[PDB]
Paper text:
The intermolecular interactions between the individual subunits are solely formed between the C-terminal domains, whereas the N-terminal as well as the central β-sheet domains are directed towards the corners of the tetrahedron. The N-domain spans from Met1-Lys118, the β-sheet from Leu119-Ser213 and the C domain from Gly214-Leu397, which describes the typical architecture of a member of the ACAD superfamily. Cocrystallizations of XiaF with flavin proved to be challenging; initially no FAD bound to crystals could be observed when the oxidized cofactor was used. A similar result has been reported for FMN and the XiaF homologue C2-HpaH (4-hydroxyphenylacetate 3-hydroxylase), which has been shown to bind reduced FMN considerably better than oxidized FMN48.
In vitro characterization, bioinformatics and structural investigations revealed that XiaF is a new member of the group D FMOs, monooxygenases that receive reduced FAD/FMN from a NAD(P)H-dependent flavin reductase and assemble in a tetrameric ACAD-fold composed of N- and C-terminal helical domains and a central β-sheet domain35. At the heart of the biosynthetic pathway, however, we discovered an unusual cyclization cascade involving the non-canonical terpenoid cyclases XiaE and XiaF22. Here we report the in vitro reconstitution of XiaF and a designated flavoenzyme-reductase, which jointly mediate a cryptic indole hydroxylation step that has been proposed to be a key step in non-canonical terpenoid cyclization.
Numbering used by the authors:
A (entry chain A), B (entry chain A), C (entry chain A), D (entry chain A): 5 to 397
The structure:
Amino acid sequence: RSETAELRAELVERVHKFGPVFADGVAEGERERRLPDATVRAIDQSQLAMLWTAKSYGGLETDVRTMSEVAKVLSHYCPSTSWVVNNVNGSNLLASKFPRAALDEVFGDAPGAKLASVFAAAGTAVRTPGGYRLTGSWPYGTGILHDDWAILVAREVDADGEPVGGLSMLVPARDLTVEDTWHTVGMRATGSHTVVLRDTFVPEHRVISGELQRSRESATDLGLPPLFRTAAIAAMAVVCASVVLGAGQAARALVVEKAPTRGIAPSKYTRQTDSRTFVSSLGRTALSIDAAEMHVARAATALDDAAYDAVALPDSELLRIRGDVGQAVSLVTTALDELLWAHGAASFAESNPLQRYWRDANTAARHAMLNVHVGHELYGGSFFGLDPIVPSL
Amino acid sequence: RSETAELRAELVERVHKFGPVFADGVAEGERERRLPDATVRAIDQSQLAMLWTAKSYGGLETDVRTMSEVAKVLSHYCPSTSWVVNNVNGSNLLASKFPRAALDEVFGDAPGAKLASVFAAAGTAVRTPGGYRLTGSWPYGTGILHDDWAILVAREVDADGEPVGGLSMLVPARDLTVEDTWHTVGMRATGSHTVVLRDTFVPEHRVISGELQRSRESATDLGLPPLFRTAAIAAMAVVCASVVLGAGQAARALVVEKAPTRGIAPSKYTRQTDSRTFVSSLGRTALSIDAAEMHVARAATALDDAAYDAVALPDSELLRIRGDVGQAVSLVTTALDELLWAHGAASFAESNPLQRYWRDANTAARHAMLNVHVGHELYGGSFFGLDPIVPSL
Amino acid sequence: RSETAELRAELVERVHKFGPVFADGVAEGERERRLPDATVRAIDQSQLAMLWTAKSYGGLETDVRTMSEVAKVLSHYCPSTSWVVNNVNGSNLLASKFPRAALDEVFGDAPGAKLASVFAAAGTAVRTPGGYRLTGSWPYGTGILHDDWAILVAREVDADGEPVGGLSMLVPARDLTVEDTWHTVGMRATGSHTVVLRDTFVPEHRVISGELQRSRESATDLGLPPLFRTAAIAAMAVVCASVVLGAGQAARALVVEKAPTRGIAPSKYTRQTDSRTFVSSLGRTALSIDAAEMHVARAATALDDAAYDAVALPDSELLRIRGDVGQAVSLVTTALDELLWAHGAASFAESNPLQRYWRDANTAARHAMLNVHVGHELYGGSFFGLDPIVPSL
Amino acid sequence: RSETAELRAELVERVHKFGPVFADGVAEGERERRLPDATVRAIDQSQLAMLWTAKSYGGLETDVRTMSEVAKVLSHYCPSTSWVVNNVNGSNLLASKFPRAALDEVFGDAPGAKLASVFAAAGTAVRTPGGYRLTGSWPYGTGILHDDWAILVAREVDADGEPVGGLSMLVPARDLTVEDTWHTVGMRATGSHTVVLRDTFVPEHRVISGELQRSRESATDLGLPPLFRTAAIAAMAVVCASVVLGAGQAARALVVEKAPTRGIAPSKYTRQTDSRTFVSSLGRTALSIDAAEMHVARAATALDDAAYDAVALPDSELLRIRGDVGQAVSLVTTALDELLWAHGAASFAESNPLQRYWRDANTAARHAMLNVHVGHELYGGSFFGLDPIVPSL
């Protein structure tokens, strides 16, 4: 309790320590659509990619709340860095569904091993002696250029080519080839490129069923540490939402910081703080961001409490969490629009971080697992026990 | 910790135990604009007016969170009862600013003593030998008909009639006269009538300065129990917001309960749950109510944590709480409008509780301490250290 | 053009002339759940129930825009009166789908004949020699107590009781029996009671198919006057939306009128107009009502233009109109909530017209033809040519 | 009437004719932050910069509604082009406040003369023999690189340097020097650079008082054509709002166009049109854009009607128009956020026009004359006759 809360405070302070390095690489990351080498070095030095790595492999092995709070503070310095770091942690946590052989191969001699993952089934696999032969093209591979391994979801087929089942497959960087497809107006430095494979061999021990990848059987396993009892897919959505939330909070802080030194054109208000319309409006916008913060924290706490108690979360609670994260990022994007209205035309200058937070948050917000409309339907459906409209929870 | 959480669960169960009595008196309360005798008996039997009464006087002496959770559940059975109960508790807590002589006179032989309070300075007082002579007319006296005492704010004047200062004055039912002025379309049974006084004597020991009434000096007093270190005015706003919130939650529960047994006219959807537009919309509306719940809980927790730690809350935190409560009730009134759209034309039948929750929540929401626009300006102003636009925090 | 615009100005002035009578009967209508005799006399004297009656029967024979503007002004004096008047006009227009024999029987010696109509198929009819035998129970019969005839939709069945088709059936007051079922918290004076029939004879000439009742074949008929080329069902939705809109505008006017003579509790603003937060907020709320006004006017103009040109409106335009009216009333209900926040706790006093407009608008807004969620789905579906989710347009 | 409506249809068709050229130059304009030469040639060939130029100088001399409708269609092809074209027309109209000598010098031998204008008083002027000496630095000079003249507002000072009054000053390209300061993430091709002047001579005939620049005395002048009776400053705000609106409409069209060929990740909906949540949500978003369209059209019509009738618009109507335009662009930015949610993660690819419309509309929306918060306060204040918070209407 006090131990896990103490660690959080230390990791938050690490983000502030290494923050200036991440901030310094923003301009280059914006140009190159890739995290600078100094940023990657800082991520490795800070151990911020190791929050959800097992303690037995030299990982920090924290909880959802801790990763969430770290994600929010990271976004102040660089949203792309925050997005990459949290996907790595999420991917590393999702890797714990694989056999020990796979985990030993990944983390055995690499405590700071970083994984990518794209869960869209964009490839086909066939059984071969000793494993599988995999072919596919997986887009939105966040941070793939810096990652050691990749978790790729694929559709198994027989000799005829008829679909038989779903698979989740762990494959190293040496077997990967990356196409340059990430040409966007937000989260540019994340380098979410397309992973390509053509008749790539993947052994049995690094392949699991799609069913086992989305399994929550470990929720009640007292043998495992609390972290690995956590609902992993929901946990990933929560920390991704935290990245977006953090950018929104940084945007709010900037607008507050600059408000006393500028006016509201073309009004008589030479100081934005002299306008009570501006001030009351900012109070409203802030409360929406505060609500988004409480949505993320509630979801994180629910996942942690269930993990520590070693109880399985029912579908209703998991569906609510999907509603929470979509709602939180939705509130942030609306709040960011209001903050642009507050700050003015100078928001859209390249020298101004406000448009940086605005663009990055909006791009990341439309990640599948953060879809607000899907979240509303999932959560609304939980009140009547309707069939979930998504495959995994 | 576990003790205070245990008590809450017991008091929540009392609300369910006595709930049917409150529910049974709804029709009469709606007619008579007054709480039925059976309801008042239940309030006295349940000890629900004694949550913020001192343990030394035989009170329960709970915290803000406990009163809040009790308020929310009470609103399911009768919002007017919930509104009256929470004002009594709030008034009883505000009475702790008076001298021991006053508190002994009120609570000494009456553990279940119930106080009214209206903080609008609607009267004038002059010094007389042994105390003051008070004259005034105080509207919105919630539950005055059932109360033993009343806390009335007044403006002190000299022999000439020139204003000299503010006063808070404790005066018994025997000295009170009540005008029938509560003719409303919501919270009818609350009986928020006008208190009238004409040259009424009030002794020194039952009069304090307006400054002392809004004081937070007791926040650091280790001699006092935690409850009386709590910021009382903010605590009252939080529990009033809980009453409104509870009605909104009861409205949501009803709409969920009835949804599978009705359609959406004039559409092809014979069942409301068959419409995914309805379901996703309900998920959205529910999340707004969930946000309002987290706003109230956050404010309650902040007040409790400060009280237990015996630390004074800074103005910024108090201004944020005023933003929280106004935002929460604002979200509830908007959510109620959405729930009427969900349920349909049958919402407005007198036999339907939905319009009951709708009307009661909306009426109570416009209590001064819950003003959403004031809350936005107070909280927004806290970011720049602007002068608060209200007299007390 | 100038002639039809001239008439509108005269009818708007009639509403102001007879308005005081409608306003005088508000208290009684609220008590009795029925329009006072003086109100019914004024409706008959003013010819306001005859706007959509044919000129050949001594009717005014106006257009949709004129009825809409009259409806909005009527709501200022009495929303229930406005709601009843517009339903009568709408019902009278819908009666033009019946044979000349029926129209002559209704309007032949009664220029000011008033019809009710409920389009929910709540009865069953069987063929009998010379017509049909009808049995059913039709709720929400707006203004039935004052009406001469009623248009009732029913499901035809054979001797076995198997459904064969839909019917629309015109039946006089002499054959009607009314159950007292209208016990509501808004639009009380409308007297929307349940119409009951038990083995009632209805002749051939006063019965048409449900298909013919929702027909728009007359849209291109140059023989008919423009009014009867109008899409009647859509026209009714537009004028019903105008009633709700008018109440919202009256609410806005009241808040503006009272703002300079009251403060914002518990703030330092003794005058509501001194608060720029209040003023800017009121400007926003007003613009939403202005948008709702333009939605209704656009729909009315589209229907009129098509009627005068004698061109048929395509489904896409009809689906858009259903989106317009639902959106307009949705904006008004949200705006009314904002106006209560603006005005304060005094809004909910029975002496205050603001809660009167608030309750009446909200109740009327949930009429099937004004369902905002249905309107959104209908209009959204028109972009892709999806099957409409409602039976008639 | 029919003549002016006929011309509009022809100019709308010109936009479609030259549209492909504007669309072809988008990529280069995005790179260079400047309109390509082919785009400038098309603007000159199409006469789209001459809509508000006088007929006596070979201009088209249209009205506000016509320029507005042209602006909306132009934004479909290139928002930057639309923004530049409408500012030129607006600037050319504002030039009609200058003496005939200035107008003859500008338009005498140049029917297609294009003016810039920045109305922020960013310079100081002193009287010199024959005119003034002007020094200043004017940012946000939209399309300055392609313009022949510039209208610059400045503060007149005496020999001591004490402020004496405001001036509006017409100065040619030959006397201008442009600093490269336009480095933005939206409306990049507009080239809104900083105009710099250092001791530049400006003769008497090309200088007017700030009072005369914002004058509406010509509103009743029957000698002038209707266009030059129009309230010029309000007219400019309306057409700027039309540019933003047009981008929003183009965004809506794209989302509708692409909806049937993509799904909603990670849901079971492989087609976006199969989700009724998506469809109803799109209907709602569309209606907000429709409301924004009616806001702009209402303002344009009010300005035109007053110009043709040669009546002066009162302050209340001008304040309402400022509310209309701010509200319209506010609805569009909110609608664009909803359209990104509808379309998904692919919205933010550089190849996708949706982010192009999103970025351009949001940047242009924060033009001073389009400030939503100022508009709300101006319009709200008009209900009580409060002093306007802006210098000119």
